[PDB]
Amino acid sequence: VIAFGKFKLNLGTREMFREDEPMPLTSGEFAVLKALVSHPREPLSRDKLMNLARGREYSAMERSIDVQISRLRRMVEEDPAHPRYIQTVWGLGYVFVPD
Secondary structure, rough: OOEEEEEEEEEOEEEEEEEEOOOOOOHHHHHHHHHHHHHHOEEEEEHHEEEEEEEOOOOOOOHHHHHHHHHHHHHHHOOOOOOOEEEEEEOOOEEEEEO
């Protein structure tokens, strides 16, 4: 489904790879990351992410959205402090920026 940086994510099977090595995604990590990458370049509020994260499983209520973002950044970013793929939009929320 989706490639960015050294990552490949399969939205249907929940398979993720870093440099082709299999890397797991908890339910809530997966829920947040899928909401982000499925809306490329649309900044998403915490409320809208929480909402989009809801599936038929323990997903949205696993951890706070900001803690999920922080964990996803530590997984995907060379520097979590200056993120490339999971960016902050001041006033607003978070955004996936492809490539």
